[PDB]
Amino acid sequence: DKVYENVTGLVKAVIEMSSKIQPAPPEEYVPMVKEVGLALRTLLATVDETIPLLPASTHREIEMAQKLLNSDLGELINKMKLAQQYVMTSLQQEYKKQMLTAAHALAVDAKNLLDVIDQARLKMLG
Amino acid sequence: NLXELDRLLXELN
Ligand SMILES: [Cl-]
Ligand SMILES: [Zn+2]
């Protein structure tokens, strides 16, 4: 199940970033966000490969879930940059928190993409 | 969705 493997890899990269966000200084964030973004890229390519075999009536819902992940990555990158802009200020930890919140949203939405695909696989069995 | 992601990713290089 490459979709499950890819979702696992993406969520693991998010959990890693979330244990390193508070200790790490805001300008070592880029490699962690990059590892998350590339895990997402892998996942999206796998889902694109898988869609043609799932029932047509499920494609739209899967496609919306994919788009949500894109928007989530955008927000993560934005919050990362803000956390960088506000290092050693009065807002440093607040923007680190916002970055954390964006990464968590990404992980949750990846799990929901898996759930939608898994339901479409069930329908396909029928 | 892949196109959009790949240009989002450009920002991290
Ligand atoms: Cl959270
Ligand atoms: Zn990792």
Side-chain angles (χ1 to χ4, degrees):
Chain A
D1 191 345
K2 278 191 104 201
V3 173
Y4 173 82
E5 287 172 34
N6 289 172
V7 168
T8 294
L10 170 56
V11 173
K12 166 194 50 36
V14 162
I15 291 160
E16 280 171 359
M17 156 176 285
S18 305
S19 51
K20 301 164 197 181
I21 277 171
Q22 293 96 331
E27 41 246 56
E28 301 136 71
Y29 287 172
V30 168
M32 288 181 307
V33 172
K34 191 172 169 186
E35 171 187 11
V36 169
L38 291 187
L40 173 56
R41 204 251 191 251
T42 298
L43 171 61
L44 288 201
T46 293
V47 170
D48 285 0
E49 259 168 12
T50 308
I51 284 178
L53 277 176
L54 301 171
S57 69
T58 69
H59 294 192
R60 186 42 180 155
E61 195 193 2
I62 294 175
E63 275 144 7
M64 296 188 284
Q66 275 175 297
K67 172 184 130 172
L68 179 53
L69 292 171
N70 273 339
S71 318
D72 286 351
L73 182 66
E75 301 196 50
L76 180 50
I77 289 165
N78 288 348
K79 296 305 163 98
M80 175 203 75
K81 287 168 167 173
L82 281 167
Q84 303 177 306
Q85 174 175 346
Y86 288 86
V87 66
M88 301 295 298
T89 77
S90 168
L91 301 187
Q92 163 163 10
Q93 217 58 207
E94 152 71 19
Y95 280 108
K96 283 154 85 113
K97 208 272 160 297
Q98 294 186 7
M99 191 186 41
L100 269 165
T101 291
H104 191 180
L106 200 157
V108 163
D109 291 336
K111 292 303 306 273
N112 184 67
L113 176 62
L114 174 57
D115 273 18
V116 169
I117 291 174
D118 169 281
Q119 270 320 98
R121 286 177 161 146
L122 177 55
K123 301 289 209 324
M124 191 31 86
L125 288 186
Chain B
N1 277 303
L2 217 30
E4 164 78 333
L5 181 43
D6 287 351
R7 184 201 31 121
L8 255 180
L9 282 191
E11 305 192 60
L12 297 157
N13 282 1

